[PDB]
Ligand binder design. Structure first.
Ligand code: AGS
Ligand code: MG
Lengths: 54, 438
């Protein structure tokens, strides 16, 4: 869903770091946004990351 | 180097007790009670007398250890002169004990040179004509483990028949009952007491601190010279045990006032000896005891304090508000509506004095509420936990409780951790620490 977005949007200023940094930034965003909601549970974060990714 | 691994393997074998039966150690505080067991069991495999004793002592008080030491000490010479019938009081119910004795009388007389077959009546009569009925016979040593379940307050048929083939038999029997109740003779039905030899021998406990350091001295010293390091390892051990101000003697001293048990020390010492990699590392690791506070911190890492430490902020405000609501009530009960009517009140009083705390709606405090019953911070109103036996956990598995048919936010929960115990354990640099007073 991201690797079709990079060609749907005509994105050529990308490398693998340019994907993994926005991936880790999204994961930190879900963490600092929703840690007071879940708690210290990997399972309640995994599915939030699975929902809010596309 | 292959010189250090021999010392480590020998040390861990002494710490587990899996030595051969000539260097297997017996501690000094339990050397008199091993003499009584040796006297009892040595006049039944040799002299072919018959009797019955009960060993009373707590858990991990070396009863199975002493008995297996005798039965491996009375097997190096008199192998063919006895067979052993060992049966628990847990995995052998009083109907499955007969099949246990029949299966263990069959397969033990096979190894020397069909009684297992039939119904329960035929099997119970096939092992009443075998035991209740110059030459030397074979004796049977019965090892009853947790005998306080066969002594239930209804019939006591197995104990009556086993203690009845003590006086009234031609086969020499010797039946050992390891139990834990100190009031074991009050359990027995009054015609099973009269068949009993009344010789109950209580296991010894540790009376002095000298017994504990002598026990650790017996456990950790090495007698057989296998590794080159042993000539140091004994002496560097004694330097820690003779000096009463070291770390090892201090940990033994605080073990003597807490759980007064050698197996807890064994489970402390075993990952110290096993995680080490060199002899100097093992030497400084037992000098400093750098692992008996790492391990001892981890043993308390989640009881009610090491996992409240890992609570998040909304969960902590919910727990504090719930403990406030239960502290305000009469008998200590509350629910999700009474808890959320204190969370928003407290947080509105937080935003009154002042940058703030986001008020989460009651659609997201439900997940927090469910995460504080899966950490056991709330119980229900009268919900008993695991039932005692296996039938009462079946009789209630078919019951449909009223506390689970009502809606979610009306279940009358109950605190695990009161507000006074919450006051002292939350750090004083918290934004809810003032809210733990009332
Ligand atoms: N047959 C055995 N061989 C080696 N070590 C043993 C043996 N039986 C017990 N131990 C060890 O001895 C210590 C305690 O011994 P136990 O015999 O289990 O105590 P206990 O009296 O049997 O407890 P019970 O049976 O529940 S009253 C533990 O470190 C055990 O691992
Ligand atoms: Mg036992």
């Amino acid at each position: 869903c991201l690797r079709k977005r990079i060609i749907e949007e005509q994105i050529t200023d990308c490398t693998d770091d340019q994907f993994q940094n926005v991936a880790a930034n999204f994961i930190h965003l879900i963490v600092q946004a929703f840690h007071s909601y879940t708690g210290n549970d990997i399972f309640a974060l995994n599915d939030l990351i699975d929902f809010k990714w596309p | 180097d292959p010189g250090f691994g021999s010392l480590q393997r020998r040390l861990l074998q002494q710490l587990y007790g899996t030595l051969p039966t000539d260097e297997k150690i017996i501690f000094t505080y339990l050397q008199d009670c091993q003499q009584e067991i040796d006297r009892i069991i040595k006049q039944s495999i040799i002299q072919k007398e018959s009797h019955s004793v009960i060993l009373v002592g707590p858990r991990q008080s070396y009863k199975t250890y002493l008995l297996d030491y005798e039965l491996s000490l009375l097997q190096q010479s008199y192998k063919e002169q006895f067979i052993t019938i060992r049966l628990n009081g847990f995995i052998h119910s009083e109907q499955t004990a007969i099949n246990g004795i029949a299966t263990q009388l069959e397969q033990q007389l096979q190894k020397i040179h069909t009684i297992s077959s039939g119904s329960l009546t035929e099997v119970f009569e096939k092992i009443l004509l075998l035991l209740d009925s110059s030459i030397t016979k074979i004796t049977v040593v019965f090892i009853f483990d947790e005998i306080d379940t066969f002594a239930g307050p209804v019939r006591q048929t197995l104990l009556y028949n086993l203690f009845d083939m003590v006086e009234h038999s031609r086969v020499p029997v010797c039946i050992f009952g390891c139990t834990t109740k100190l009031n074991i003779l009050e359990y027995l039905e009054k015609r099973v007491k009269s068949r009993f030899s009344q010789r109950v021998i209580y296991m010894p406990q540790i009376q002095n601190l000298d017994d504990m350091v002598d026990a650790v001295r017996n456990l950790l010293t090495v007698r057989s010279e296998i590794s080159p390091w042993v000539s140091q390892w004994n002496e560097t051990l004694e330097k820690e045990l003779s000096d009463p101000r070291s770390n090892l003697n201090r940990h033994i001293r605080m073990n003597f006032e807490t759980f007064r048990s050698l197996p807890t020390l064994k489970n402390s010492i075993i990952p110290l000896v096993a995680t080490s990699k060199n002899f100097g590392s093992l030497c400084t690791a037992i000098k400093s005891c750098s692992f008996l506070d790492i391990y001892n911190k981890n043993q308390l890492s989640n009881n009610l304090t090491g996992r409240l430490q890992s609570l998040s902020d909304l969960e902590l405000a919910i727990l504090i508000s719930a403990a406030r609501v239960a502290l305000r009530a009469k008998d200590g009960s509350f629910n999700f509506n009474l808890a959320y009517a204190e969370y928003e009140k407290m947080i509105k009083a937080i935003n009154s004095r002042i940058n703030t705390i986001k008020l989460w709606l009651k659609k997201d405090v439900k997940n927090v509420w469910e995460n504080l019953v899966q950490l056991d911070f709330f119980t229900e109103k009268s919900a008993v936990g695991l039932r005692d036996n296996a039938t009462a956990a079946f009789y209630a598995s078919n019951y449909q409780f009223q506390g689970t048919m009502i809606p979610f936010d009306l279940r009358s929960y109950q605190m695990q951790i009161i507000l006074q115990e919450l006051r002292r354990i939350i750090p004083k640099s918290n934004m809810y620490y003032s809210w733990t007073q009332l």
